[PDB]
Ligand binder design. Structure first.
Ligand SMILES: [Cl-]
Ligand SMILES: [Cl-]
Ligand code: NA
Lengths: 182, 182
């Protein structure tokens, strides 16, 4: 299905939508998040490690290093590969959705998150990366909102069928209609 | 002076069983630690000074990160975190005493990620975020460590002792046991 037709951008990051006479307000940041999670999750989209131009070498504490080692397998399932020596880790590849992020901030952030876990699972790591570590977004445009919803419709069919309250809300016309008649 | 009571024993590697005027309680040492550090980092709740690193930490930042840092510069300086910025990078020149022995190559990027998502910047709010992201103190707490921590918390956070939140301290009900003995 579909969220409908994008009508206009509301308050820099929402999209006013129309579907069968119904008007809705959708949060683009929330939609972007669901999209990224699906694109990063093995089993919901193609996952292929992408080589870094220049590998990112980082110093890590022993507890971080140890966390990285236990997570190696989960990370590789996400397309995140690295090698490491005594005091460092060097990121050699990341999945496509991450290739254009600022990895000098994202990876150290991922490392901090990983150093706090007891269990490592690609699914939960993808979700975390999708919600917290990714590129913030400035003013949204129509072209961007249109593209986003289309991608979300394609990869997250379920969101369409049952959109949470933080994703899309009903814009009630009854008051205006009544006010026009009355 | 006012206190949480007498430390009786360590429970679950990170909690402390307390006794105060006949009442028994369980206190989360990690939570107590976070309040202590939050206090040590908050201007007005404890002394704050800027200590230079012997090796400035340079980091690449996105326009959005760059911008966020710009807006938070004053609040950060109040916390003793000083930095310089050039086109694409920022260089941390100094950090408060409680952050000297941390993994800044991980913590600063996390702080930057956190700041990039804020709209309002206040030293108090930022210090709270920092205290919650410092690497967990110990792992297996000892009696001496808990006794020392609590004495410090008592002097720097007198209000916690008066109104200990439920995340910090919980009552251990002896009534069932007393009834059972009967
Ligand atoms: Cl537009
Ligand atoms: Cl447009
Ligand atoms: Na970021």
């Amino acid at each position: 299905q579909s969220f409908g037709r994008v009508l206009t951008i509301v308050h820099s990051d929402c999209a006013l939508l129309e579907r069968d006479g119904n008007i809705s307000l959708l949060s683009l940041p929330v939609a972007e998040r669901w999209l990224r999670q699906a694109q990063l999750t093995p089993g919901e989209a193609p996952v292929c490690a992408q080589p870094l131009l220049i590998p990112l070498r980082l110093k890590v504490s022993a507890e971080e290093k140890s966390a990285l080692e236990k997570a190696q397998s989960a990370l590789a399932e996400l397309g995140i590969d690295f090698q490491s020596d005594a005091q460092h880790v060097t990121i050699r590849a990341v999945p496509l959705p991450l290739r254009q992020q600022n990895l000098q901030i994202l990876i150290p952030e991922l490392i901090g998150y990983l150093a706090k876990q007891s269990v490592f699972e690609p699914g939960n790591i993808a979700q975390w990366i999708a919600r917290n570590l990714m590129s913030e977004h400035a003013q949204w445009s129509m072209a961007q909102a249109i593209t986003l919803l289309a991608d979300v419709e394609r990869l997250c069919p379920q969101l369409v069928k049952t959109p949470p309250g933080g994703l899309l809300q009903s814009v009630d016309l009854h008051p205006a209609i009544k006010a026009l008649k009355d």
